[PDB]
């Protein structure tokens, strides 16, 4: 495995439902690679939120920020990385979505008020899954 995920920081958390996701990603690349990394963020209520390409992959330990666009109960976000279109790591988080204030939570409206939803990504409980792939 040439590339390894070393850590993820969920920077803006808690945030509003409509706020973008700002992640700090730390990874290590042991050797020179021919192709691109693609980092992807997926919403699971389902829809791909955003992605970012890194190419050529800088060797060594690298730290970067990934700003993913927002989407449109408890839900899940998946942060994955692929090399040359082959997925080798995935990090899943559970997300608690609740209303701003006491009365909205107890008496929620029929037509949901997106602007009053605060999401809280449970960043201490990531599910990390690795897959072995061909590299170069």
């Amino acid at each position, epitope marked *: 495995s040439i590339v390894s995920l070393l850590g993820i920081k969920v*920077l803006n958390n808690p*945030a509003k439902f409509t706020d973008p996701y*700002e992640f700090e990603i730390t990874f290590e690349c042991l050797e020179s690679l021919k192709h691109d990394l693609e980092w992807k963020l997926t919403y699971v209520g389902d829809q791909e939120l955003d992605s970012i*390409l890194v190419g050529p992959v800088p060797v060594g330990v*690298n730290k970067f*920020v990934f700003s993913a666009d927002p989407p449109s109960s408890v839900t899940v976000i998946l942060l994955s990385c692929s090399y040359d279109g082959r997925e080798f790591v995935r990090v899943g988080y559970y997300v608690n979505n609740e209303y701003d204030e006491e009365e909205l939570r107890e008496n929620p409206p029929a037509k949901v008020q997106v602007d009053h939803i605060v999401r809280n990504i449970l960043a201490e409980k990531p599910r990390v899954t690795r897959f072995n792939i061909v590299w170069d």
Partner: antibody, heavy 118, light 108 residues
Framework: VQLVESGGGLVQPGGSLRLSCAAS????????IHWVRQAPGKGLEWVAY????????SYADSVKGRFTISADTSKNTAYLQMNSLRAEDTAVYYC????????????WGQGTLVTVFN | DIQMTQSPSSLSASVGDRVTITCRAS??????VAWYQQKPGKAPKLLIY???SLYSGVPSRFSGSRSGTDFTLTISSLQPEDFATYYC?????????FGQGTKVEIKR
């Protein structure tokens, strides 16, 4: 939306100084607060940022280990604690806000001067 | 480690001219690039973010574009208030870095 800085002025090498950044018109919890400095006649230099929501920070190589950024959400205010000051830290220090701009700074304070004199 | 190499350091132009400022990322950057305007003794002001998104209230004659690792700021038709210093910025990689800046001065 205002960012008001305070705490600048004169200080000696090795001494310390605390800058404040009071925010009005928005909740700092939903943004990141940044410090940018500009030495006299020089270009902009990014210093540090903090996400008050998570407490996560980042420091420029020139100040890491010497400056510490922090925030108090209940007061809607951010701080830059500057220790082990050197002459080259003399500069105008700006406070700035980033919100939904991929860490671009959309609002800036007017700046406060920090002068390190022997 | 990443550098944002901004060029030219200065350029002379006239009212109405189309000017171009370039800023080269030393390694790949997706979109987290911004452009700022600073006038003497004043706080900088955000013009472009996300490489090409015009910030609210900024005149449309400022536009940002990209070609590979080259990030460009274009001022179509300079106005007298546009003569100033301009800075690029990247905020994808640690650490956030500004370019060295470009003076846009008046030709006479």
């Amino acid at each position: 939306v205002q960012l008001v800085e305070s705490g600048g002025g004169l200080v000696q090498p090795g001494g310390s100084l605390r800058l404040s950044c009071a925010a009005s018109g928005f909740n700092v919890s939903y943004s990141s607060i940044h410090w940018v400095r500009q030495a006299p006649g020089k270009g902009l230099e990014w210093v540090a940022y903090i996400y008050p929501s998570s407490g996560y920070t980042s420091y420029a190589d020139s100040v890491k280990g010497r400056f510490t950024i922090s925030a108090d959400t209940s007061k809607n205010t951010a701080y830059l604690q500057m220790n082990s000051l050197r002459a080259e830290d003399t500069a105008v220090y700006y406070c700035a806000r980033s919100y939904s701009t991929k860490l671009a700074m959309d609002y800036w304070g007017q700046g406060t001067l920090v002068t390190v004199f022997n | 480690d990443i550098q944002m190499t901004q060029s030219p350091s200065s350029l002379s132009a006239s009212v109405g001219d189309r000017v171009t400022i370039t800023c080269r990322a030393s390694q790949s950057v997706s979109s987290a690039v911004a452009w700022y305007q600073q006038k003497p003794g004043k706080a900088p002001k955000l013009l472009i973010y996300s490489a090409s998104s015009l910030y609210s209230g900024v005149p449309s004659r400022f536009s940002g574009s990209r070609s590979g690792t080259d990030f460009t700021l274009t001022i179509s038709s300079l106005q007298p208030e546009d003569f100033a210093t301009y800075y690029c910025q990247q905020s994808q990689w640690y650490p956030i870095t500004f370019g060295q800046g470009t003076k846009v001065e008046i030709k006479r």
